[model samples]
Target: TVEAKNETFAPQHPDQYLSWKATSEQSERVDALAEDPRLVILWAGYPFSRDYNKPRGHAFAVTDVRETLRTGAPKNAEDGPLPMACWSCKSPDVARLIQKDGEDGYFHGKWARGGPEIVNNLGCADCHNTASPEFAKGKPELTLSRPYAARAMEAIGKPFEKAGRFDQQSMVCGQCHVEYYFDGKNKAVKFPWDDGMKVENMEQYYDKIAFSDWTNSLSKTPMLKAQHPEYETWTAGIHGKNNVTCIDCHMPKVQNAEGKLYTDHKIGNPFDNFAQTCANCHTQDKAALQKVVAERKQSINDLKIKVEDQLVHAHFEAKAALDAGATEAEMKPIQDDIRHAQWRWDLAIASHGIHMHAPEEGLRMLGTAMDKAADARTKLARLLATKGITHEIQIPDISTKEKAQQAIGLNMEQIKAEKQDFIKTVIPQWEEQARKNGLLS
Candidate 1:
């Protein structure tokens, strides 16, 4: 019952269940692309440019994936642009389906191929050892559910079984909150940590394998999109080195009326419960802690904005160089610089809270990102002079989400209409099938 649906455990563990479910009420959805139109040009040819938003809590995991434009509207469940592996990070049922079908077999089809059986959102089985004796007392033990994460740990020379409880706490989050790519002939989620978890290490691995997330339409340069690499980034920081894991801050323990301690399932901002989370180490007042974090984040945000602006210009300028009779031989160096710059920029920001997790590394990465963007711009200027296109390459009007999308050649109206149609017709069919299979109640 617990594996099929997390709600089955609610009655036995009201405090834990209710706190976990509270994620459902988290309504602060930041429409990232809309707020920062520069992302449109940055992710020009990528599906993320279609629609990207700051993720809500785990309760919205399934709902958000179903509604996001990146998935594309399917004529049938098997017709969407994304592969079946896309759902692997979003639901427990994905693990169930993977168990049913071998890893290779599970990810070889189109997205939502398992949608009918994947109605449940992320919950208990995702991180906790349900069989642990403490679980009955409402204290969950950490465990890794995704096989890829375990393999990734082994590849990095740190087996999951060998990890201590402190490391296991963070490793559970690493299973999904990581930078991964679909591997081999069939799309199977694999974290590119074979060499190491550093930005340069992963870059070298991707380069050696000639792997790219997508090629930018404007620059015609192969690009790597950094998924939320929270695990990787955190591991490099001082906190992680000292064994300060994710749950220590995000899910600090709390006591009920009976004075029984349990890990708070309302996992979110440490600021929300500073008395319990941040106050454990930093005896500083909440305002002081908040101010420090705010200042650091603001600095990182500023650097990110500068990098975005620079790369936007560089991509457009590179496109102009091509239009002005520049060949791949000439544009290759410039493209490489732009690709590296974009990747650096992405690494700094992709993780949900880099400023707090590792501000030093974030600033360092963003600084290099700026340097690469500047180098690409310089190369573009010199190359354009040779082609007689000495005039400045005018940046396109991408001041708003719609305008930037238009600049990138997307038809939002058609996209939205088709998605609405999919939800109305296909989702109900999936639900009905799930119910019949006893996967959903």
Candidate 2:
């Protein structure tokens, strides 16, 4: 009866399902947008470009990443589209399947070749326990028997009882949303948190391994691509510092006529739920609070435009150094700087709700990012001057995406045509095989 009532009054909008639906939508958007062109260039020369995209809604979870253009459509065992590791966060179907087939077996093939049958979308199962005291609560607390709670405790070197309390809050979102890497050598989904969550900390972790997500085609510099750090950045803000959970903002609760509380799940800015989000704690009028949120977003966007100009220049300068026969070793620091500078620039903008969320801290982070980017550019200029290279670095003709691809040294014609070829020739076969194997239908 409750389910029927919900479906009836819920406006046919997925967001109306609250936490579960919002989680699904965000996962979808993240995977889909992860493939944007600017992202493609940022990850140029990396496996990610072969298959990155912003995530979309939850309902499309298993199918979206599997069929994404970034992960080449593998037709068979020899040409699997992605690694087994790729499925880790896409679906709970993966966890179930991986247990049946050992992790080694799971990692053996290319993407899409072995596993179409097991994939499913993101859901409450991603973090909740269907069989616990918290089960019908719809907000699964960690003390309940849940796989995530257990493993997270083990990984953090704490007892489940002690860890359970903290994980019960919004920190649970980082289970998949934040920056991470499968430490293939270490056989762990490492968070690089040994040092901290700052740009410098992660960079240090990557440098220790001499890690490079991809060698840039334009500059030939080893690079690192930062995944979403929403939780981490939030941690550094006033709200996070003040112990605000994601639920506090994105999932604020509304009391219905029956006096039962349900969280609003239309994920985005907190201003959208002013009455139940900020107003719950803030005495300010809804319109006034919304203006604060809007102004903060605008400030970040404005700074982003400024940062982009510097970043484009930095990319060109690094490329010019290589063209002038600079050693890979000599060019590395500059490339790393370019990479780090851009990462911070992206972080400041991507973090969302800077000004209003934590007014002072937001301004500080942005100011720090601008300063660092300016410093990086200044150093590049000095390095070029030292080489007697005074001419302006030739910037690429990025009028169109095709032009941008060419400018970045990608074989645009070949990659584009080949991608189409894979879609037409290979995908159908993989699907058929998966169906035959009872992996899907």
Candidate 3:
């Protein structure tokens, strides 16, 4: 080990690479949830409606998680809207806490119960074993530290050790980036991959368990929220069949100014570094590759907006039908259609970079969602006619985020005030305890 600044030990030359700094320096793009009002309408009843931001670098993971409204205003360790499972992906300290508490004990309570214990953000320890000399020397023998991911791999019959290097590298990301939900019984994080990884298959899995994230406030349909499913969607694409791992594109190998090659850890759109990321395999100029990507994204974006409009209309229309005294039995099928349609739509759009990763699959999913949403509207019209309200329901002016939130009956001022109080009063205490426990500086 070579001694560096602050007496830190490195396995090789002291200034050989500063990969950590490079990874953390990667710039964050605009938050999609903040920019789009349709998302506010779509996630009306959820905490995501209050705040949702695009993820930044690993360096900001802990800060972002602590500041997000989804965690709620916890006054104490036992107070919060979320479970301890929320910390699984945000910090390496989670692995240490799980060791001390056991997986069940660690994951079975409020998120704040582990707040002080989980202080460090994403780091090498989250993905690699520091105790192993090989790992310390930067040999590529990473392990799956998150128990939830390990269980998911076993369920899918692809145990981590059995996988090849490329698959294992991909699995490191699949652990957290895939669509998942807490088991209703113990709030244990579980990926819905028993049947398969397709959107329909996971939907079937959720249906069998009668699981719904929440009932839509307007449509009153049971709903499922999709987290990013980058790995799963990629598995169904040409890249997956061709054995192209996520690291191939998102973390391509590149040489620094001094000509030393290292894996680029700034995970994001390959378009940002097309020459190093895509040109190796595609044999096309950066401009040509970019044009292809731009065209594909534009097409997907257009279809996504169309589906978003349809869903917004359907939700209000369902509310109107119910207000017109439509019975549950009468609206049950329509509600199911709305649920399934939105699930398909969300699956296509929620997966990160779907247009580039699997354009064909993304298009097909969007087409299905559009068809299902149209079918729901058709049923809704007939139902409305039976109730003698035989005209299109007038959608209110949801032209802005504030207006959209108002339509959904959210008290944004109150929510913001409570969040502020929590941050000011509760977070400092957490930081204090974490420092005391040696979990943070």
Candidate 4:
């Protein structure tokens, strides 16, 4: 726990600490919604519509979570909408607290109740076992501190505890990177892997449980918003079959100025030190490697963008049908289509790693997603026709994020103002409290 927050570690592992901090750079952050306005409409009923960004990484885990509008503005410990489990992936202190209070106890309430309770950013304690005998011997060892991932692996007949080192390397990343939902009673984190890891398998699992992240504000569909499923997508990709692990590329070994080899801890875009990664198993230069990556990304983006536009149209048309007096009986099938449709594309888009991880599978999923969106639209159009509104369903002008949010009735101004005050007033107290408690010492 001390290692998770203390700066004393930096002197002992200078290169790795500096490399880890590189993730804190401002340039990696992006207003993902501003880059693509459609997400504002797509996540209409969810808080993600309020704010979304490409994360800066573990270095800013605590800072980024506080800043995002998705957390909202909590005046005190018990005031926000999200559950305490929302802190699961953001800090090593979550593991610490879970130890103090069992998973159920820690995950049971509003994160606002416990946000300040966890001031440590995600770091070594979450993945590396400081308690291990290996650590006592000064050896680097990996472990999954979170229980959810191990439970998931067990359900699929692949118990994580028994996995070999190579498998464990990627498995640790899966602890948070895989798709999961906050589950029953206590709002605890749970993975949808009792059936399987395939997109279709999880889709069926959610259907079996009748799980829904939220109902769409416009389409009235029960949507399942997936989290980043990097491990899942990577498994279906070429690398997984070849036994290539995430750490092999993103944390590849590099030689220091003294020519001593050590695994870099940057944990970011592999291209930052591109050649070392691909060149291990590739003969092509970085130039050729990027062209290969760009091809997959560009093609997948084409289909992904197509799916997005189609989904946008389907949501609006369904909303039109609703306003024109469409019945629940008539919209039931359309709603199913919208749910299944968006889930597929959301799986692909949420993890940009899928662009390179399994681009072919990504394109395949988007193709099916587009088909489902069109199915919803077709049903919507027929229903609209029955309502005596035969003209093409007119949608609002949502050319930008603000316009898109306005179309969906999101009051961003109020959200922003409150969030600003929370950041200014509440967050400083959290940091000072943490220091006093020794979390940031």
Candidate order by decreasing lDDT = 1, 4, 3, 2
lDDT of 1 by residue, 1-441 (tens): 237488877998888888998888776879999989999899999889899999788888888888889988877666888888788888888766767776787788788677787888888878877757787776666778788999999998879999887888899989998999988867889999999998889878988999988999999999999989999989988889898999989899998889988888987787898989989998799999899999999999888898899999999999899989899999999999998999989988998689999999998989988989999999999999999878889987999999999998888899889888888888888889988988987
Candidate 4, residue 66: Cα displacement in angstroms equals: 0.7
Evaluate residue 235 in candidate 2 and report its C-alpha lDDT on the 0 to 100 scale: 69
Over 323-441, each residue of candidate 3 has an lDDT whose tens digit, in order, gives 99989999899988888888899889887578888998898999999988999999999999999988889998887777888889988888778888988887788889877865676
Q: Who wins the lDDT comparison?
A: 1
TM value for model 2: 0.78
- Worst 10-residue lDDT window for candidate 1 reads 1-10
Q: Where does candidate 3 stray beyond 4 Å?
A: 1-17, 27-29, 256-258
RMSD of each: 1.5, 5.5, 3.0, 1.5
Off by over 4 Å in 2: 1-41, 47-56, 77-82, 102-109, 133-161, 164-167, 185-188, 255-259, 264-269, 350-376, 382-388, 411-441
TM-score of candidate 3 versus the correct structure, residues matched by position: 0.93
* Ten contiguous residues with the weakest lDDT in model 4: 1-10
**Which should have the higher lDDT, number 2 or number 3?**
3
- Count: clashes, candidate 1: 0
The RMSD (Cα, Å) of candidate 2 is 5.5
lDDT of 2 by residue, 1-441 (tens): 001122322343333354554554444344422323454455556655445555455566566665666666465555743565566666655544545665555555555544544444554445544335454545544332223334543544544556544445555565665566655642344565656776667767778887766677766666666666665677677787777777788767777567877656555666766888888898999888677777876776666657666776777787777677777677766776776776566555554445554555545555666676677667777778777798778676654445655656667567657767876766566567656765443
lDDT of 4 by residue, 257-280 (tens): 999787787788787787788788
